[PDB]
Amino acid sequence: MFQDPQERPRKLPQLCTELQTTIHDIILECVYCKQQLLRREVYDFAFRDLCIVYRDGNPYAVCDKCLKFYSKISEYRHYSYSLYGTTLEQQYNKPLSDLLIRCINCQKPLSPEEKQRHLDKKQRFHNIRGRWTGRCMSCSRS
Amino acid sequence: KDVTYLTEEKVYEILELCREREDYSPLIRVIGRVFSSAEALVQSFVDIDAIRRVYTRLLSNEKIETAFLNALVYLSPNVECDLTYHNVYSRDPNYLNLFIIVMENRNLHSPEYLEMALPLFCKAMSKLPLAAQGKLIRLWSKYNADQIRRMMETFQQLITYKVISNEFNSRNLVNDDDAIVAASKCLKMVYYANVVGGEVDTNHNEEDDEEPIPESSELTLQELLGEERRNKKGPRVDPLETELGVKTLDCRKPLIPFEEFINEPLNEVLEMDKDYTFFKVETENKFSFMTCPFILNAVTKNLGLYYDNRIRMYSERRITVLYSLVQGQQLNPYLRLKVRRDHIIDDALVRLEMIAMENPADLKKQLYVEFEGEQGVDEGGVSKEFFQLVVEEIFNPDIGMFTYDESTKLFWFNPSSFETEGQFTLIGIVLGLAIYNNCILDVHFPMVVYRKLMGKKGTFRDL
């Protein structure tokens, strides 16, 4: 059981080993709809570097539809300001390569290649509730 | 007698000779061949008093004044290149000396300089890297009030001059003029010198920023990310405030009143909807005066804030619609309050608290009031009446929440109040809603209250 608030695994791979099971074996519920994830979604949850949410010692993930939906709502709600990558580097005194930026549509962390694309196409990065976001390749093409 | 760098003594060599030969052209040759060169200047000295003596001697001759002017016009465009492409300051931190030398010239504010020389110099100066600006601002903060006034005036006259001389319209924005933008950035540099030069009380007056916990949805998304304890991030902070370590709110008393930094001609011409857009969305080719708030008057600022409030209200309306499309749930796009004339405080409390507890984001919707039993469309008049009633009821001595001073005609919090923390929360919310809906309230609080709201404790001087 994961009824200890502090000492339960956070990332799906860890939960796999903690339950002596593999990503190919495990079945999980989405934290909003409590519907079961498709295996494709489970993989993507691992790829998106997201955290397991726990209620009463039970683990929950998030499916694709819910994640996109709530992310889009959060964009509409806590948008702050948009900067160019160059400007952003100066505000944070670090190169964009190193700065933590996620996909605004699907939370997937952005690769330095995608970060470069933002600089190449003179596109801005959006601050939402104090965290920075951009658009990954799979969301700038749709 | 050619020389690569210049000093007071070197100048005196020529003062005497030029008088003795009844000429000035050799000294003009010299000064031109000197002051046209950034390197010569950077290498020449920090020796403030020497510079002051030199200017006090040289500017006494009209022929030499035109030479200074003509040298400065040649100098600045090259300095802009050094700062923009060669990062010279990062190679030699003495480069800042150049600007210090030029700024001690007392005649920069005469019209001859305002038309061309000073604009070009502003273009160059406004490109300095933040660390250099910080070095310069810290120096200026030691100057006398009249000198701050002079520097302020030097740029104020320029901003005024360019606003008056050029025709601005909805297609030709003040935001597109490099001269005014550069001048404003310079003036910002002076403004922070005024801030840091005033009385600053940082160690005995800070109050914690209390933030309302967001709705469960945003909480779950924050939990799904690594942000469970990172709820406190602060608003958009000005880079110079970071470099200087002192906020505009920390200065208790400036050297020159902040109101003198307001440029009324500029405010009469500035289109705030577009400025707010440029404030929200950074564009390489356009500036935003909201990044320089000291220059805007309260009307112009309020119009910016009103655009923020309206854009948010409209965002919440979009969210309402999106929720209805995806989950079928029907949420109200307005902050619809329904209250009874005999129970205004109670009805308003229960409703605003149920709203704050069920969804703290709802308080950011457009206010709409309905008196139970009355019928009309709230075009603001019903809201205004609601505010009058609430304010009158809350300040009645029979409720005991506030004490009224006959002398100042101001209200202050009753320490002995047994009333619940609810009513105090209600009056707080009402003030918020009033700003959000641009409605004036007949409330009479002493300055300490607005300081405490901003997160600064009241100090002895606020009594």
Next chain:
Amino acid sequence: VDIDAIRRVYTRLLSNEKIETAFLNALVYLSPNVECDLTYHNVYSRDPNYLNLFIIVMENRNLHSPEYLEMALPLFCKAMSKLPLAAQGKLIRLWSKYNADQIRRMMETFQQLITYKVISNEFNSRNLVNDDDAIVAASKCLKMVYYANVVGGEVDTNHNEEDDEEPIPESSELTLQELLGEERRNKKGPRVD
């Protein structure tokens, strides 16, 4: 590119003294920015029409009056002398179609400037003419005119070339040339402009 329109415009505007000072005061503002465009932004490589600017300015007949020589023309020379070679080639080919008196005017416009700066400044073994950006820039402009004069003259290239006969070097240099891949590459020409 509308040369004749420019000429008409100048012929009408320069008739008013107040407007002359405005042209001068605008040119002094313009050139230092153009130098930046050419030196840091390579604007011509983005828009080959950028050359139009210089063509427009050069049709001003008053550039050679002293008021221009002291500041406006030097600054304009600093800007112009930074043009990339291909642009200079475009400009020179245009100038080579002008009348002799116009070449003379342009030549004179820079000659007066070089003369003026040489006479106005004190040069010595520690202050070399080589260190003055104004004279160097002016000279590079004048070079631009010079080649216009060359190309505008009578040129006979197809019936008059003779082979460059070079004396074979000493055996030592020959062996070093043989040890390298240069057995047949004895003909390389002097430093070409």
Next chain:
Amino acid sequence: WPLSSSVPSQKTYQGSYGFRLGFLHSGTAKSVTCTYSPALNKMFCQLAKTCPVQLWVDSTPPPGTRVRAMAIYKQSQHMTEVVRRCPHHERCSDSDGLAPPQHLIRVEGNLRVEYLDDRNTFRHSVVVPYEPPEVGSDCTTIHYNYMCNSSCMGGMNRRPILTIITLEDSSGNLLGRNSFEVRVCACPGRDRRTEEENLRKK
């Protein structure tokens, strides 16, 4: 070499300080020296190239807290074996630093590093003092280097290894623990894409 050893516990434990890790999100191009996969919870890096690791805590640990790195084989049949640098690299002149030629892991840029051999299990470990984040930072970055290739015969010999990072007090008591898999290889971007694709295909 020591032929047997006890098995250190590998279970993640955030403890009273919320101890968790982070990694700079890197691409998969042929030129990448180091790159991390969240799906595999796995680090792919080149021999003796810098691998940056971020440390995250909810509250600052007590003074004298330390950060220890220890390596074990991931496959249960080998968990009792000590991970040692392969002999050809143990014999290489590159061990000119302050870490034993048999130590696989080395720390770059921090001279307060202690290369420690477990007196009871013989396991090789690297320890540094814990350092709070820099002004303006939320996390502390440490730089690790792996001095042997996972494919090495007589060493790792293609067996996957798990790096366990432990947050400890000045006496070695466990304040927090987390872990991740490592693959030292000539072409990280390629190998990462390969293992990730194999995972997605399943």
